[PDB]
Automatic annotation (TrEMBL):
<dbReference type="Pfam" id="PF01353">
    <property type="entry name" value="GFP"/>
</dbReference>
<dbReference type="InterPro" id="IPR000786">
    <property type="entry name" value="Green_fluorescent_prot"/>
</dbReference>
<keyword id="KW-0157">Chromophore</keyword>
<dbReference type="InterPro" id="IPR011584">
    <property type="entry name" value="GFP-related"/>
</dbReference>
<dbReference type="InterPro" id="IPR009017">
    <property type="entry name" value="GFP"/>
</dbReference>
<keyword id="KW-0455">Luminescence</keyword>
<protein>
    <submittedName>
        <fullName>Fluorescent protein plum</fullName>
    </submittedName>
</protein>
<dbReference type="GO" id="GO:0008218">
    <property type="term" value="P:bioluminescence"/>
</dbReference>
<keyword id="KW-0599">Photoprotein</keyword>
<comment type="similarity">
    <text>Belongs to the GFP family.</text>
</comment>
<feature type="binding site">
    <location>
        <position position="8"/>
    </location>
    <ligand>
        <name>(R)-malate</name>
    </ligand>
</feature>
<dbReference type="GO" id="GO:0006091">
    <property type="term" value="P:generation of precursor metabolites and energy"/>
</dbReference>
Length: 214
C-alpha cells in the first residue's frame, strides 16, 4: 500500500484575497486511516495577511479521512498519482473564495499545491476585520456525479461576538485515474487552530474527519 498508517505531507499555497497576494508553506503529519492530521504553516510572502486565517484553513487534505470498509475510499485509492479538487465558498456577505488544488504522493509523502482566490469581502466584514473564531464542526454531503466525487456543505465560522458567519461550500474531487467512486455518504469534519502567533504568520492546525453512511 503506498498509503502507510503514518504519512507526512508538504504543502505550497499561493493566491490572493481582495487584491492581496501571498504564499504559504507548510508541513504536516497524520494517520490516514484514522482520519487525523496536524500541520505547521507559515506565511512566506505577503505577510502579515490582512484577512482572517480562517478562510484559508479548510484549503490547507482528504487522503486523511477514516472510511468504513464498505465505502470506497476514492481519494486514498487515487494514490500515488493522486487527484485534484476545485471548490467554491459563497459567504453570506458576498465574499467568495474559489480554489484549485493538486495532490500527489512522491517518495513516500503527499505533495499539495494549492491556489486560492478570494474577492468581494466587505472591508468592514468579519473576514477583513479578522473577527472570526474558527469553524464549527461540519458535515460534508458526499456523492458521485459526472464521474467525479462531489461534496457540499454549509460551514459556520464562529464570530468574536458570539454569532456565526456562514458559507455555502461546493467541492469537486477528481482522481487522476478512474478509481472506484463511492455511493452517497457523509464526512464529519472538525478543524481546529491549535496554535498561532499574533499576526498569524505562523500557525498550526489539527483536523479529524470520518466518513459514515447518511
Amino acid at each position: 500500500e503506498v498509503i502507510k498508517e503514518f504519512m507526512r505531507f508538504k504543502e505550497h499555497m499561493e493566491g490572493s484575497v481582495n487584491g492581496h497576494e501571498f504564499e504559504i508553506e507548510g508541513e504536516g503529519e497524520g494517520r490516514p486511516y484514522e482520519g487525523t492530521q496536524t500541520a505547521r504553516l507559515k506565511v512566506t510572502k505577503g505577510g502579515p495577511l490582512p484577512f482572517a486565517w480562517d478562510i484559508l484553513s479548510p484549503q490547507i487534505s482528504k487522503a486523511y479521512v477514516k472510511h468504513p470498509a464498505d465505502i470506497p475510499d476514492y481519494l486514498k485509492l487515487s494514490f500515488p498519482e493522486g487527484f485534484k479538487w476545485e471548490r467554491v465558498m459563497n459567504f453570506e456577505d458576498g465574499g467568495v473564495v474559489t480554489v484549485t488544488q493538486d495532490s500527489s504522493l512522491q517518495d513516500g509523502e503527499f505533495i499539495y499545491k494549492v491556489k486560492v482566490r478570494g474577492t468581494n469581502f466587505p472591508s468592514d466584514g468579519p473576514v477583513m476585520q479578522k473577527k472570526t473564531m474558527g469553524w464549527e464542526a461540519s458535515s460534508e454531503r458526499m456523492y458521485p456525479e459526472d464521474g467525479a466525487l462531489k461534496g457540499e456543505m454549509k460551514m459556520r465560522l464562529r464570530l468574536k461576538d458570539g454569532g456565526h458567519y456562514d458559507a455555502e461550500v461546493k467541492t469537486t474531487y477528481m482522481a487522476k485515474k478512474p478509481v472506484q467512486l463511492p455511493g452517497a455518504y457523509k464526512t464529519d469534519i472538525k478543524l481546529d487552530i491549535t496554535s498561532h502567533n499574533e499576526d498569524y504568520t505562523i500557525v498550526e492546525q489539527y483536523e479529524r474527519a470520518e466518513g459514515r453512511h447518511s
